[PDB]
Amino acid sequence: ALAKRIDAALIMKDGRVVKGSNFENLRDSGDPVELGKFYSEIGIDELSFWDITASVEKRKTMLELVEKVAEQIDIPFTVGGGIHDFETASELILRGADKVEINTAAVENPSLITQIAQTFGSQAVVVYIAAKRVDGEFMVFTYSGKKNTGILLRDWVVEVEKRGAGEIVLGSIDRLGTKSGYDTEMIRFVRPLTTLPIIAHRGAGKMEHFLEAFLAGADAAKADSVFHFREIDVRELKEYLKKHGVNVRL
């Protein structure tokens, strides 16, 4: 029925893919640009490039990345990782990114969502929401899961749409590092609260997990290590989803 998207996320530091990948056909399996390009050719629909360059080289590193990526790939991509204000987001979109992915800076200043959207459109703004169960409630976490904001997921989802975001990535900290499946309970919780596309993140271990996420109401599903270490083949995944009635691009 409804069209569904398959996303790959690449974690990057100092220009390199953190922990690389298992694609031996590649000249450089740790080159984010070559790996991204390869993904774009075998069936990934959209890419996310996440930078954790901790040095003062971060800003130009991310700019050089988006420029090289835009030159080599022809599917939409998002860039993220410590994007804290409008000028940083703007530089990155102009240099070639289709979208920016923001989290902590958005929670601390939700008007940042609106400021990026008012120049680049809602479709250019993706808000990543890291959430976790705490005393029986879904709470929003910031600073790479270090801080419980005390903000209810329910309230933040509604505010994010109100401020003009285009898409929500819903990352379950309750599933980080696990391969037991996406947090379908969390996706089902968020689905009726927003009209925005919901992208599932964290927990994927096998093809059937993607099917479960789409049944839960996700519009897209994003993963990283399961692709890079080839626990799941992307072509096989889309073939599988299509076979069982999911509207994926094949």
The CATH number for 47's domain is 3.20.20.70
CA separation for the pair 54, 207 (Å, rounded): 34
Q: What is the DSSP letter of 219?
A: S
Which residue range forms the structural domain that includes residue 135?
1-250
CA separation for the pair 49, 19 (Å, rounded): 14
172 in Cβ contact with 203 (< 8 Å): yes
The CA–CA distances, whole Å, from 72 to 33, 143, 191, 212 equal 7, 32, 35, 33
Residue with tokens 């968020």: 190
The CA–CA distances, whole Å, from 55 to 1, 51, 59, 60, 71 equal 46, 11, 9, 11, 25
CA separation for the pair 217, 180 (Å, rounded): 18
Give the tokens for residue 231: 């626990």
Residue with tokens 């285009």: 166
Please measure the distance between the N-terminal and C-terminal CA atoms of the chain and give it in whole angstroms. 14
92 in Cβ contact with 101 (< 8 Å): no
The CA–CA distances, whole Å, from 83 to 1, 100, 127 equal 35, 8, 11
Q: What is the CA angle 130-132-135, rounded to 5?
A: 150
| Number of domains composing the chain | 1
Pairing of strands 99-102, 125-134: parallel
Give me the resolution in angstroms, 1 decimal.
Answer: 1.8
